[PDB]
Each structure stands twice: as C-alpha cells, then as structure tokens.
Design a protein around this ligand. Structure first.
Ligand code: HEC
Lengths: 55, 431
C-alpha cells in the first residue's frame, strides 16, 4: 500500500506496475513459443504429426 | 539434305546419304500408346517385342538383316537395317511379317514366352529406372484421363491380362494403310525404293480408317511416389508446352536450352554460361538436372527433371530454378538468347545427323506422319536465328508466368514442399 490504506502511493505504483508487466508477459510468450518450436504442435488425433506436415 | 516423299497407293518417304555404309527400311504407323485404352495399355509394346522375337529375329539374321522397333506416344515403328545392296531383301522380310506371318508370330508358344519377357521388362523399369519412371508418371498426371497419360511400355496390370486377340484387334484397327508411312534412310535413292514398292501390288485392308477419340488436355496436378529407402530424390516439373507444328515450337526449345542440362561431377558442366548455376553450386543443390521441351501431336510439356542427394534443401533447388524461369518473362538477356541459339543448333544437328540411319528413320517417319513433310535442318536454323528476346518473353508470359504446373517425384521427397508453394513461385510480386 505504501501507507495506512489504499491511497495515492498505491494507485501510482499500481499504474507503474501495470505498464511493466505486459512486457514481462511478452518475454514469457517468447519462452512459450521457444518450447513450442522444439516439439511442434500436437493435433486432434493425439498421435504423431511427423508423417504429414504442411508449411 | 534432300527430303523426298511421294504417294501412289501408300505414302513413301526417304532421305538419301551416299556416304552411309548401311541402309534402313521400315514402316511407321500413325498410332502409338496415345491410341490405346487404360485396359489394353501395353499392346503396342507387346507387338514390338514379338517383332523382335527370337524366331522372327533369327530369320532376318540368316539373311543378314538387323531388326529394330520403337514405341512412342503418337506413333509406332518397325525397322530393318541392311547393306546398301540388300535393300530389296528388307522389303521381303517386311511384307513376310506384316501379311504372311501376321499369324505365325502369334503362336501360343511364342506369345507366352514374349509376354513373360515384357513383364520382367516393365517390372525392372518400375523397380529401378527412377528418372524415366518419374518422367513417365509426369505425363500420367499432367495428362490424366487423356491419351497422353498412358505409359509407352504399358502397365503391369493391363499387360498380364492381355491376350492374342487384343494384339489382333489393335493391328486390324491401326496397322492400316491410311495410318502408315513406309520410310527408308541410309544411302538408297527414292526412285530406287518406290519401284520395289509399287511393283508388288495388293492393297490389304484399304479404305479402312482407325478409331477416333477425345483431345488431350493438360491438368495442373501432381503424383508423389515417396520412397525413403531410395538414396536420392528424383523430380520432374513442367508446364503445358508446345505441340509439334506450333509457331512457338522453336521458341520453346530455345527457352529450354537457356537453362540446359547439368552434371555436378563433370568439371566442364560446372562452367556453363547458365545463371542458375551460381545459386545451385554453393550448397550443391543437386547432382544433375536437365530441361526439355517435349512436343507431341496435340500438346507438350516444358519443364525440367532433376536428381539430388541434398534432401534437406530440395526447396532451394525448386525455388532457385523457378526464379530463373521467371526471368524469361521479364529480364532474359540478349546474350543468354544468343548462347541458346548456338547450342540449340549444335544439339539439333547432332540429332538430325548422327552416324545411324535407324535414328534418321524415326525422326523422318514421326515428322511426315504429322505434317506430311520434314523441315530441312537448314530451314530450322533460319527459324532459330530469327528468334528475338521479345519472342521468348511473349512466349514465357503465356506459358510460364502464373500458370499451373505438373509435378512427379520418387525417393526421399519429404522436403519437396506442397503444390501451392511451388505454384506460387511461377511468378513474382510487383508494384
Ligand atoms: C495454461 C496453458 C496455456 C496458457 C495460459 C497459454 N498457452 Fe499457448 N499453448 C499451450 C499449450 C499446452 C500449447 C500446445 C498445444 C498443442 O499443440 O496441442 C500451446 C500452443 C500455443 C500456440 C500454438 C497454436 C495453438 O493455439 O496451439 C501459440 C501461438 C500459443 N500457444 C500462444 C500463447 C500466448 C500468446 C499465450 C498467452 C498470452 C498463451 N499461449 C497462453 C498452453 C498455454
């Protein structure tokens, strides 16, 4: 809170943090795509997709 | 250099060359695999095989005659070679086999031994001749459900179910007089041959005409014969080309010469004046490739074939090759065209004038059957030299630019991308 209750310090730090997190999410999305790339997507049959891929 | 041809009852075509040691005589029929059905497919090839049977061949060997036959798409031919003096004994053997022995060759002991040979023959082809196998399937998919789709050697299934009656039925419908041309090459004169022919009378099935059909058509498509056990990938890709007797017959052949053929192991081949080679040699995208302009009666195929062990870069092979072809519509240079003219003449010459009369017969026969005459080698060169950059561009912009393609391949082709990716490369983005 930065004080006795939700006040000015609180809202100002929450705006600063609201601006920051989206960029950390962006970095996590890249890590998410990196893990996706090494094994590729799965498919509705639940089996290997290695015998028939399309670009 | 002279192309003489006259008609009396049968159309006689010859081309003399006194310096030739031998003389070849034969009949060329205006019907081939393109006239067959999906079910009797392989009958023409079968005919060729009995004509060269041990029995019929031994009869000609005693007499000092050599046999040769060729089954194509638009035509078919039976040839007998001999010395310049025995030019009469070739006609005896020709008539003796197409009238007298038109029932002695078809015995239930000769036919079976022959059928067993074309079966092991056509099987061997499919099992090992990958480049020709791929080229044959290219015609198969490109011209599906149309005459040009049928393979010349026939299919194993239609072959093993073929009988003596099918041979006869075909022979009595196509081996007619109005669907034939007697050809003679070597050294013998035109007047020399026509006399020995106009001497022996008898028409034998005159006035009879062969059955008709439906016109051939190109269909953009593909057939993928994946086989990961083969050590390479063999592919053929083409657009609808030019039929023989087409105004652009030569423009097309020149265009193919621009990209020509290649062999990565031949030092000299790596040095040709072909821009595409700068791209493909860096990572060695292929062992070989060769462009062609195949022409037939109703249509043709213009494209290339290639073989490669670089299985993870097949997409670059296809991409660089198609980017080069894009150039023909927009930026081909004067010097590329000029280089092509010179090399086209050299190859066209080496074909039309080899030291073998049997090749001459096939070339002569095939031409006269379609246009009633043969264009002299010197006449071709006049047409070839007259081609301008503007011509090649107009041709490419009609045949290559944003046009459907046909693809066929076998071996390790997992890396050959989908149809649409290949098809998209038939052009370029512009403002
Ligand atoms: C808690 C689970 C979960 C969350 C939240 C999540 N992902 Fe995924 N994502 C997955 C999984 C698991 C797959 C693999 C799916 C498959 O291939 O079957 C996947 C696959 C993908 C794919 C491939 C296409 C698809 O839809 O399968 C993309 C792109 C992707 N995620 C983007 C994102 C982004 C962008 C976010 C959020 C901002 C996100 N993901 C959040 C679990 C998640």
């Amino acid at each position: 809170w930065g004080g006795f209750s939700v006040s000015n310090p609180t809202i100002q730090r929450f705006f600063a943090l609201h601006y920051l997190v989206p960029f950390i999410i962006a970095a996590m999305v890249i890590m998410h795509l990196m893990a996706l790339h090494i094994h590729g997507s799965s498919n509705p049959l639940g089996i290997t997709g290695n015998l028939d891929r399309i670009p | 250099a002279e192309v003489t041809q006259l008609s009396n009852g049968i159309v006689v075509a010859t081309e003399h060359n006194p310096s030739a040691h031998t003389a070849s005589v034969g009949v060329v029929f205006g019907s081939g695999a393109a006239n067959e059905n999906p079910y009797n497919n392989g009958v023409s090839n079968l005919w060729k095989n009995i004509f060269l049977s041990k029995e019929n061949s031994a009869v000609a060997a005693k007499e000092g005659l050599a046999l040769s036959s060729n089954i194509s798409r638009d035509f078919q031919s039976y040839i007998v070679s001999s010395l310049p003096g025995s030019t009469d004994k070739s006609l005896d053997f020709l008539n003796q086999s197409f009238i007298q022995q038109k029932a002695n060759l078809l015995s239930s002991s000769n036919f079976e031994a022959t059928k067993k040979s074309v079966l092991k023959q056509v099987q061997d082809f499919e099992d090992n001749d990958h480049p020709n196998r791929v080229l044959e399937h290219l015609h198969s998919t490109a011209f599906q459900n149309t005459p040009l789709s049928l393979p010349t050697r026939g299919t194993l299934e239609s072959l093993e179910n073929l009988v003596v009656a099918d041979l006869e039925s075909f022979a009595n419908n196509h081996f007619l007089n109005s669907n034939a041309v007697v050809v003679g090459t070597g050294n013998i004169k035109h007047e020399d041959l026509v006399n020995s022919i106009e001497s022996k009378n008898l028409s034998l099935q005159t006035g009879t005409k062969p059955v008709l059909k439906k016109k051939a058509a190109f269909l953009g498509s593909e057939v993928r014969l994946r086989d990961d056990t083969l050590p390479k990938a063999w592919i053929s890709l083409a657009v609808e080309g030019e039929p023989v007797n087409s105004p652009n017959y030569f423009v097309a052949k020149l265009a193919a010469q621009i990209f020509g053929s290649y062999n990565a192991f031949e030092p000299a081949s790596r040095l040709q004046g072909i821009k595409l080679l700068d791209n493909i040699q860096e990572y060695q995208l292929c062992d070989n490739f060769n462009h062609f302009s195949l022409s037939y009666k109703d249509s043709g195929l213009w494209g290339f074939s290639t073989a490669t062990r670089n299985v993870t870069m097949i997409d670059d092979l296809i991409h660089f090759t198609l980017k080069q072809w894009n150039r023909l519509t927009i930026s081909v240079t004067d010097t590329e065209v000029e280089r092509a003219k010179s090399l086209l003449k050299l190859q066209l010459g080496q074909l039309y004038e080899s030291g073998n009369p049997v090749n001459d017969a096939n070339l002569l026969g095939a031409e006269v059957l379609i246009k009633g005459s043969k264009l002299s080698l010197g006449e071709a060169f006049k047409k070839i030299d007259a081609i301008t950059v503007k011509d090649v561009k107009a041709w490419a912009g009609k045949r290559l630019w944003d046009q459907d393609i046909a693809i066929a391949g076998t071996g390790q082709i997992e890396g050959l991308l989908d149809y649409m990716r290949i098809r998209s490369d038939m052009s370029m983005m512009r403002w």
